[PDB]
Amino acid sequence: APRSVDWREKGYVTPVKNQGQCGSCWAFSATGALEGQMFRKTGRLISLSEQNLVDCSGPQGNEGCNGGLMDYAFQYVQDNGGLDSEESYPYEATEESCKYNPKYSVANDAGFVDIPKQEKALMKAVATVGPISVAIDAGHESFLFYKEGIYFEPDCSSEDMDHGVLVVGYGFESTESDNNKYWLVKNSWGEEWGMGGYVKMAKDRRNHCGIASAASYPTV
Numbered sequence: 001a002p003r004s005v006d007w008r009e010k011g012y013v014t015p016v017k018n019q020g021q022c023g024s025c026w027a028f029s030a031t032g033a034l035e036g037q038m039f040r041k042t043g044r045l046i047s048l049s050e051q052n053l054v055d056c057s058g059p060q061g062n063e064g065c066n067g068g069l070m071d072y073a074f075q076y077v078q079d080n081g082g083l084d085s086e087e088s089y090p091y092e093a094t095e096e097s098c099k100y101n102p103k104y105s106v107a108n109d110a111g112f113v114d115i116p117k118q119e120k121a122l123m124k125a126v127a128t129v130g131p132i133s134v135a136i137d138a139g140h141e142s143f144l145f146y147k148e149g150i151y152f153e154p155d156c157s158s159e160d161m162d163h164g165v166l167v168v169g170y171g172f173e174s175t176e177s178d179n180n181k182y183w184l185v186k187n188s189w190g191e192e193w194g195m196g197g198y199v200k201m202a203k204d205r206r207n208h209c210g211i212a213s214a215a216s217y218p219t220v
């Protein structure tokens, strides 16, 4: 792979969103990955509806504001034959009945790919595909209060992930030979969290916080 990647500078990534108090992180991770893949396909970045996923992807196994999986979201888009734009189907931060309208569909997918559970494979996928949906262990105060720098939490688990986010790149800080490496991660807690809503997360430390344990992307 390249030494560094940042898909934001290539037009693949919408601004940071805010999921509010709803457990819909999975929907934000999924829309982020599909926003990227649709851009790869068409050259047009269009913000997609998390609310559409929250309201409508129960049949695939999702549980709305009570949680879900990005792969189930990708399966919904495939089964449904579409996903509405954010503009047409705006975010309300609470579960409502499904009001999908095919007139306003701006995305589709033909399934998904689950990435092997290690960081070399994740790096390959980030470099060659685009932004990647991942889950992390975000269950520490250190994550809530994260400001800047490369996040490393001694108590992070590589197995207990609770939060879906989006890897939009990776790179290094300091002298290259110091191996001070990170994943560049878009969160859905607004721009006031973290570094404008982003976090740099420890890379190549044996799957810190489980970032490579549940990584996937939609096939477009």
Ligand SMILES: *C(=N)CNC(=O)[C@H](Cc1cccc(C)c1)NC(=O)c1cc(C(C)(C)C)nn1C
Binding pocket: 022, 023, 024, 025, 026, 061, 062, 063, 066, 067, 068, 069, 070, 071, 134, 135, 161, 162, 163, 164, 214
């Ligand atoms: C975010 N606001 C709430 N978190 C979730 O919805 C997590 C995200 C997650 C965690 C681990 C792996 C992935 C790919 C995503 N969802 C879950 O923990 C979750 C939901 C479910 C079902 C829908 C099957 C009950 N299972 N898990 C593990």
